[PDB]
Symmetry: C2
Subunit: 145 residues, 2 copies
């Protein structure tokens, strides 16, 4: 079926947490534990702003487990990022911390662009395409009838 722990990157989260996708989000939150890095949250807030950002952030803190950039995350990310730099692979800081935080929390990373995280999978990251995730929740919605 699907693991109980998941996460999103900022672009995927902007999609999931829209007014538009309300129904799909409601089911996702009823069924899964969602562990977001604080860096994902901040990037989501940047999109939601462009506001009463403050009130939006209180909503998010209620409904998601917001994971700080912990020392062990910084450490593990520095190790991963040193490997990626070794291969001339450029992912920005957001992507590295997002991926390391998913490794840390054993959360499946749902993203519209799994391919760019592919080189991190060797450090324990797993990913799922967002279109596929959405399709799976859409079936649950149908099934509720």
């Amino acid at each position: 079926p699907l693991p109980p722990d998941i996460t999103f990157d900022s672009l995927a989260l902007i999609k999931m947490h829209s007014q538009n996708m309300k129904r799909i989000l409601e089911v996702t939150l009823a069924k899964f534990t969602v562990n977001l890095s604080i860096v994902t949250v901040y990037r989501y807030l940047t999109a939601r702003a462009y506001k009463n950002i403050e009130a939006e952030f209180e909503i998010l803190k209620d409904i998601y487990n917001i994971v700080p950039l912990l020392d062990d995350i910084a450490i593990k990310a520095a190790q991963i990022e040193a490997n990626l730099i070794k291969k001339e692979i450029t992912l920005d800081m957001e992507d590295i911390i997002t991926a390391t935080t998913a490794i840390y929390t054993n959360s499946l990373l749902v993203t519209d662009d799994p391919k760019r995280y592919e080189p991190i999978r060797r450090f324990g990251l797993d990913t799922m395409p967002l279109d596929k995730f959405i399709k799976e929740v859409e079936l649950m919605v149908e099934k509720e009838l």
Copy 2:
């Protein structure tokens, strides 16, 4: 023109930890409070990891001398506000953390943070910072 609270971005922090800079860092740690963003710490650890140093230990060494500032709620909120008006994430968080802590941001490249100045950031090029500290050495 140095205040009691200062911070560095990651390239500056790396330079600060070089052997030739040991005196400058010693004065800085003795006479100022240095408030680093966790993101700056992560980038610095990246540099040390790329050179195969003991990352765990180095983190503990840093935690013992710096005030390491998490990406706090208020920092996340303020940073999003800044980024939405206007630079990568490291730059935004570094600067927002500087604003939050009221630390002077000491950097190799002040000009890239020039757009955050409207939200209250103060910056200083590292070259000038070092001169000011050189002066304190003469004591």
